[PDB]
Design an enzyme around this catalytic site. Sequence first.
Site, PDB file in Angstrom:
ATOM      1  N   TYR B 142       0.836  -1.192   0.000  1.00 27.16           N
ATOM      2  CA  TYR B 142       0.000   0.000   0.000  1.00 27.16           C
ATOM      3  C   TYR B 142       0.880   1.256   0.000  1.00 27.16           C
ATOM      4  O   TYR B 142       0.717   2.136  -0.836  1.00 27.16           O
ATOM      5  CB  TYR B 142      -0.964  -0.014   1.182  1.00 27.16           C
ATOM      6  CG  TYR B 142      -1.920   1.157   1.248  1.00 27.16           C
ATOM      7  CD1 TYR B 142      -2.963   1.280   0.339  1.00 27.16           C
ATOM      8  CD2 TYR B 142      -1.756   2.157   2.210  1.00 27.16           C
ATOM      9  CE1 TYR B 142      -3.868   2.349   0.418  1.00 27.16           C
ATOM     10  CE2 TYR B 142      -2.646   3.234   2.304  1.00 27.16           C
ATOM     11  CZ  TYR B 142      -3.706   3.309   1.408  1.00 27.16           C
ATOM     12  OH  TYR B 142      -4.588   4.338   1.447  1.00 27.16           O
ATOM     13  N   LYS B 146       1.181   3.933  -3.072  1.00 24.11           N
ATOM     14  CA  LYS B 146       0.835   5.324  -2.844  1.00 24.11           C
ATOM     15  C   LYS B 146       2.027   6.263  -2.916  1.00 24.11           C
ATOM     16  O   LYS B 146       1.856   7.412  -3.346  1.00 24.11           O
ATOM     17  CB  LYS B 146       0.018   5.581  -1.593  1.00 24.11           C
ATOM     18  CG  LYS B 146      -1.249   4.736  -1.471  1.00 24.11           C
ATOM     19  CD  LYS B 146      -2.170   5.049  -2.643  1.00 24.11           C
ATOM     20  CE  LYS B 146      -3.585   4.580  -2.436  1.00 24.11           C
ATOM     21  NZ  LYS B 146      -4.372   4.802  -3.668  1.00 24.11           N
TER      22      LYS B 146
HETATM   23  N1  NAD Z   1     -11.517   4.415   2.046  1.00 24.22           N
HETATM   24  C1  NAD Z   1     -10.463   4.831   2.772  1.00 24.22           C
HETATM   25  O1  NAD Z   1     -10.475   4.749   4.063  1.00 24.22           O
HETATM   26  C2  NAD Z   1      -9.258   5.406   2.169  1.00 24.22           C
HETATM   27  C3  NAD Z   1      -8.055   5.903   3.032  1.00 24.22           C
HETATM   28  C4  NAD Z   1      -6.992   6.459   2.103  1.00 24.22           C
HETATM   29  C5  NAD Z   1      -7.084   6.489   0.776  1.00 24.22           C
HETATM   30  N2  NAD Z   1      -8.224   6.014   0.088  1.00 24.22           N
HETATM   31  C6  NAD Z   1      -8.261   6.091  -1.428  1.00 24.22           C
HETATM   32  O2  NAD Z   1      -8.974   7.067  -2.164  1.00 24.22           O
HETATM   33  C7  NAD Z   1      -9.426   6.523  -3.446  1.00 24.22           C
HETATM   34  C8  NAD Z   1     -10.946   6.374  -3.302  1.00 24.22           C
HETATM   35  O3  NAD Z   1     -11.175   5.394  -2.237  1.00 24.22           O
HETATM   36  P1  NAD Z   1     -12.546   4.498  -2.135  1.00 24.22           P
HETATM   37  O4  NAD Z   1     -12.890   4.372  -0.740  1.00 24.22           O
HETATM   38  O5  NAD Z   1     -13.587   5.145  -2.925  1.00 24.22           O
HETATM   39  O6  NAD Z   1     -12.041   3.144  -2.830  1.00 24.22           O
HETATM   40  P2  NAD Z   1     -12.879   1.894  -3.304  1.00 24.22           P
HETATM   41  O7  NAD Z   1     -12.185   0.613  -2.927  1.00 24.22           O
HETATM   42  O8  NAD Z   1     -14.197   1.969  -2.557  1.00 24.22           O
HETATM   43  O9  NAD Z   1     -12.994   2.188  -4.904  1.00 24.22           O
HETATM   44  C9  NAD Z   1     -11.861   1.937  -5.798  1.00 24.22           C
HETATM   45  C10 NAD Z   1     -12.295   1.495  -7.148  1.00 24.22           C
HETATM   46  O10 NAD Z   1     -11.361   1.318  -7.812  1.00 24.22           O
HETATM   47  C11 NAD Z   1     -11.633   0.347  -8.871  1.00 24.22           C
HETATM   48  N3  NAD Z   1     -10.391  -0.246  -9.424  1.00 24.22           N
HETATM   49  C12 NAD Z   1      -9.495  -0.966  -8.719  1.00 24.22           C
HETATM   50  N4  NAD Z   1      -8.521  -1.382  -9.525  1.00 24.22           N
HETATM   51  C13 NAD Z   1      -8.959  -0.856 -10.812  1.00 24.22           C
HETATM   52  C14 NAD Z   1      -8.408  -0.899 -12.278  1.00 24.22           C
HETATM   53  N5  NAD Z   1      -7.259  -1.546 -12.614  1.00 24.22           N
HETATM   54  N6  NAD Z   1      -9.090  -0.270 -13.248  1.00 24.22           N
HETATM   55  C15 NAD Z   1     -10.212   0.339 -12.820  1.00 24.22           C
HETATM   56  N7  NAD Z   1     -10.791   0.458 -11.619  1.00 24.22           N
HETATM   57  C16 NAD Z   1     -10.089  -0.182 -10.666  1.00 24.22           C
HETATM   58  C17 NAD Z   1     -12.373  -0.671  -8.081  1.00 24.22           C
HETATM   59  O11 NAD Z   1     -13.040  -1.568  -8.814  1.00 24.22           O
HETATM   60  C18 NAD Z   1     -13.221   0.242  -7.173  1.00 24.22           C
HETATM   61  O12 NAD Z   1     -14.444   0.552  -7.910  1.00 24.22           O
HETATM   62  C19 NAD Z   1      -8.661   5.102  -3.545  1.00 24.22           C
HETATM   63  O13 NAD Z   1      -7.369   5.292  -4.167  1.00 24.22           O
HETATM   64  C20 NAD Z   1      -8.518   4.737  -2.051  1.00 24.22           C
HETATM   65  O14 NAD Z   1      -7.348   3.915  -1.874  1.00 24.22           O
HETATM   66  C21 NAD Z   1      -9.281   5.499   0.837  1.00 24.22           C
END
Ligand code: NAD
EC number: 1.5.1.34
Lengths: 236, 236
Positions: B142, B146
């Site tokens: 991760y 990132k």
């Molecule tokens: N949710 C949290 O607590 C948290 C904390 C830090 C960062 N983030 C980040 O912010 C962003 C938004 O988070 P979220 O909660 O909406 O994430 P999520 O897991 O709910 O959504 C991520 C999406 O990415 C799509 N995806 C994954 N690999 C893919 C590919 N190769 N091509 C296309 N789509 C792909 C997935 O299918 C999913 O729809 C992400 O990068 C997530 O890591 C989230």
Amino acid sequence: EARRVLVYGGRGALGSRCVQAFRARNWWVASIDVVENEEASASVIVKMTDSFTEQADQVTAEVGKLLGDQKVDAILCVAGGWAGGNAKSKSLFKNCDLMWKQSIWTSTISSHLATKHLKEGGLLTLAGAKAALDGTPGMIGYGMAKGAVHQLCQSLAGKNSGMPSGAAAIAVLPVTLDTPMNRKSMPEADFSSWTPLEFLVETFHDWITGNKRPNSGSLIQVVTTDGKTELTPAYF
Amino acid sequence: EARRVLVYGGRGALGSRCVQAFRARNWWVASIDVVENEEASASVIVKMTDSFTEQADQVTAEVGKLLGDQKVDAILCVAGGWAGGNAKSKSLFKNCDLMWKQSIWTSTISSHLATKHLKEGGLLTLAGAKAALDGTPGMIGYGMAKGAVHQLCQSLAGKNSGMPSGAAAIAVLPVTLDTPMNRKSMPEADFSSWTPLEFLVETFHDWITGNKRPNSGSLIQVVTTDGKTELTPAYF
Ligand SMILES: NC(=O)c1ccc[n+]([C@@H]2O[C@H](COP(=O)([O-])OP(=O)(O)OC[C@H]3O[C@@H](n4cnc5c(N)ncnc54)[C@H](O)[C@@H]3O)[C@@H](O)[C@H]2O)c1
Ligand SMILES: NC(=O)c1ccc[n+]([C@@H]2O[C@H](COP(=O)([O-])OP(=O)(O)OC[C@H]3O[C@@H](n4cnc5c(N)ncnc54)[C@H](O)[C@@H]3O)[C@@H](O)[C@H]2O)c1
């Protein structure tokens, strides 16, 4: 103070020099690369595949069988290579794919191997890039690959990363290495600003045998000016 | 001041909220994910494959055919997901593979798409992590994923990166987002410290329509304390 070393990217320019150099001192050295190093004590051949987990599982299993209950003094991860290109480049994808496989994949397996086979007080070296300390607009993939390595080095020095007690994770950040390939491909460049391979070999040797070893999580810039190389810490 | 948006990871928690929100304002929105978003104007389905170049070429070609000569106001790369594990973890490889595909692959294609289809003065948003600004011993993959995104953001703000004139590359660095999944998986945590999805949506909206937009290459930490979110710049 060492007799057991693994060289990841054992057939590269640097890696090859390491194997030779350590073998000359009668150390047991294994080379891990996409091809064999007949000069090494042992050779592990990485399987060419798009599947990270397939490649990783293969190396881990094979190193496991090769070492048994023996721990190594050091794992020198010297695998890499370079490819250029901005975000608009037609070759971006191809170059990124390669950059990730050479630096990210190797760095990751190496790290895992360190947790399993490195002695306490042992050393792990990673290959970063001074350039990756900033934005690298003309070499997207490379910058990203090396940036990730830098970050990983930070992780391994953290509490409960899985690293053996007293072992160190150190990243080397060169500009340009003096290699015959570099020479052929950049013929009118100032070689006096390129780092001799022997300098790194001598440095690694020092680090292994306890001489002048920097803290774990250290980013060490390797910069050569007028044939004189200097080591300068950088912070993440 | 925008009517054309691409959402990369359009079916994720955040991504879904974006599509809905922009569609509600009568903007044309395309979702790019591993599955379709019937709520979007258009949907591009990413092909599941271990081959980066195969996936990348597929998305590029399809977006190309979908847009023609039309430029978009913004590309919101909100794809990601989380997986934990130290270097010793048995699941390290599997987790790393996933982390790379979700954050590195997506970020890279997005970047390439920006150079080809973003209007001048347009916006590209990337998804980073506040945690990745340091070593992440308990989440190797991760942190690495990132970290690379952070680095890439730096590259895109550099001279001749391929980005359209006056367009901006901005990375958002959250801690935790308020998602039903997070809620189910961390039931006794303090939700008052989780960032509401709507806050990001409103922010993105601002950035697009020219309101309070930070410089290109900016790393914006998103931190919520007692239900109040604040934006704080971080430097690479
Ligand atoms: N949710 C949290 O607590 C948290 C904390 C830090 C960062 N983030 C980040 O912010 C962003 C938004 O988070 P979220 O909660 O909406 O994430 P999520 O897991 O709910 O959504 C991520 C999406 O990415 C799509 N995806 C994954 N690999 C893919 C590919 N190769 N091509 C296309 N789509 C792909 C997935 O299918 C999913 O729809 C992400 O990068 C997530 O890591 C989230
Ligand atoms: N040569 C330079 O000017 C320069 C500048 C900065 C950094 N570096 C770096 O320092 C390290 C040593 O550089 P070098 O000049 O010896 O590189 P090299 O290209 O000469 O050697 C790298 C080796 O890595 C091996 N390798 C690549 N992908 C591999 C995989 N998946 N598994 C196993 N082996 C793999 C290759 O086969 C090759 O033997 C590399 O990370 C390189 O990027 C070099």
